[PDB]
Write a protein that binds this ligand. Structure first.
Ligand SMILES: [Cl-]
Lengths: 240, 240, 241, 242
């Protein structure tokens, strides 16, 4: 579809409409592979999806995948992304463990091959960073040809991760993280970009109307042939 | 068999799950053609669809179609089916008139050709009668090769239609009605059969496990390659 | 698609056009499941498909399936259908054995479940009998709700099968055969019906313009939402021009 | 969608035959399909096979064909080089109806992207790969990946590049500008089929399959498409890692 831009009134409507788009894949009768984002943007969306699938056994051919992961330094516990996805949705929605596929540093080199063998991703539900990052593809360090790759954590990135994605302390920041690169993301059959808040308005303008550039990684997503963007009024404020 | 049988706890769950299946088509980014049923079975489903699309301008490529129609004798007003669909959904959901395609006795002969030119039906949401009828395809009088056809109203049919559709008023029963025949229904890319209540349990068993026969018209729907049935426990009680 | 009727000049054109339709599935980049017919109608079509895929390793996600099978009575060899499919296409086209899925009396009870697990049939290429049969769904004995089933061979059926399949040898006609029933056939995502010759003109008219009836089994195929018929002029002669 | 599929054929003849079979998968689709098709010497044999498959057949009447670039002849009012070559290579001998031929020109370029979306979008684009990695009229360094259908001024070295790749080395008829579907418009197609033949394209093909995404080698961005099939002959695939 020519990129479809959906502008909702607020976070609540953005969240509801996004849940309806994802339900179109959840209700498909054959197997569907969905890569889903963590973070605060999808919290309400996941509350709607929880109410739609909790206690229902007939969505057993829906397989869920994390698209990035940050392990806890010196700890054997599950990483931050799958942990947040369980808290936001897999646990309360009662998703079967055999339908949850975890990406880690250990299986990253086989992740792209496993997805193609499973029929490829039907949908990726992603968020947009204030700086235009998507998944773990950050400004300037992003390479568009990258598939699933390991990214070293150095310098200022230590405090940024400790304070934000981890929301704990310096000691738990590992040496590196894994992310599906832009090529792996673009390989999905369909993309659903959810955007909320004034802090994302500039990044959204650069994605919709700006040039394709590694400085604003998500700018490459406008090249996808099947992209739907669901933004609230605050996030769409800079669009013309 | 591809046929997917979904058994919900009750009418409320049946209605919610059915709305999520229809939202998969409503949220598709390109044009979709949906034929939708009237009657009491879909009332709650339409309440959910109303809340999902009311006041939203981004589902403007969704086109809706009635699959049968009974005009009011001697009156030029719209028939009973489109009138019930407006009350149950098009009016409260604020569906644009340009996205509502009415089937009448006058345009029936051109209906099948107009649908194929519009790309064919993407989905038909139909109900199941206690006698196994679907659309206006009634027991014994149904012909499986029929496309969109006019059906004369005679004998006992007059009182049945007057009481079930026109509040027992026999003077408003017309000479005939129009219905998409079994071949026209089967030409849809996907079928969604919604069934609720103990009164439908026997018909549902005949459809899922019985032989293909004109005596139980809906029995032919099990031959469709893309059928999803959403029934509540009461309607699924005779299934093994 | 509203049933699409393609009328070609003769058997050669019918065969070429049919090969192009099947190549649309063979060239799909992901896995496709194709159920393919034996008999004389598809012989030339298979010669075109052989030339298109022989010695090519990039169509390795195409899986082929027989839709019926008649074993040789008292013999342990492969049945007549898979044997004819190997001679007409799998052998000369060099199709890998891992991409050939055999239906037999022994695995019939699991056939429908195995197809759905593999993603269902993408296409079924079938022929039309002079009596309107398709697969092993013969007149009057056909039941439209049937999935993959075993069919007993009795009375006149014995000589008909011996002469049309086992070179008139009645000792090789078994007690029964297996066929994908009308419901299993209709479950395919797409149907391609190939028809050639004056002997099929009456059956084709009954299918395209006649009522749905067990007397002419293929008459039910006009209810499928994705059917393409490729007939030559001789087979289309009774259709209303 | 499919992880990019790389098909390596023995020679130009096999490349041409296999490419015709892939396109026939769209031509035989029962509903309307929109195909954008390339001119040039690479698809000549492919078009001969497609001509034999559709000539004298009235049942492929819902197949609509589109040119993805156009270079008018300077000071001449005749049709441009792309639609002219497509007619000579295929539309004329294949007897394609004029109502199924949709021409892109400088005059209707501003409405081209909107007309395609209204028609349901492109189902397939059959494109060639230049020795320098160009695709359509998206040439090295001057290409912008966010571009949709745009007019491109012709200046300096671009005169010989356009004359040799589009107008058979004739520099005298090179106009002031040309029109091309930009990388964003190309990437909007539902499926891409990249055909590549000859030793002169081996380096560009390696940069596309194994190199980074760069405007220096425009076709390098096509590896981001979720539904790409590449059909190359041995000579063109010679630099790919065995
Ligand atoms: Cl966030």
């Amino acid at each position: 579809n020519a990129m479809k831009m959906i502008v909702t009134e607020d976070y609540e409507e953005m969240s509801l409409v996004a849940s309806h788009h994802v339900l179109g894949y959840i209700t498909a009768p054959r197997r569907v592979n969905l890569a889903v984002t963590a973070g605060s943007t999808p919290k309400r969306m996941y509350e709607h999806l929880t109410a739609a699938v909790k206690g229902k056994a007939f969505y057993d051919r829906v397989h869920y995948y994390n698209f990035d992961e940050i392990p806890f330094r010196g700890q054997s516990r599950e990483g931050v992304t799958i942990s947040n996805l369980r808290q936001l949705f897999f646990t309360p929605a009662q998703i079967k463990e055999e339908n949850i596929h975890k990406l880690t540093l250990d299986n990253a080199a086989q992740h792209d091959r496993q997805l193609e063998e499973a029929g490829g991703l039907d949908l990726m539900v992603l968020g947009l960073g204030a700086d235009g990052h998507f998944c773990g593809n950050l400004p300037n360090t992003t390479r568009f040809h990258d598939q699933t790759v390991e990214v070293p954590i150095h310098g200022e990135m230590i405090a940024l991760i400790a304070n934000s994605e981890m929301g704990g302390d310096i000691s738990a920041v590992p040496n590196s993280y894994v992310t599906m690169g832009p090529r792996s993301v673009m390989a999905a059959k369909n993309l659903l970009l959810i955007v909320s808040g004034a802090a994302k308005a500039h990044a959204l303008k650069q994605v919709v109307e700006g040039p394709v550039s590694v400085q604003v990684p998500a700018s490459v997503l406008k090249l996808h042939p099947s992209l739907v963007i669901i933004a609230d009024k605050a996030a769409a404020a800079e669009l013309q």
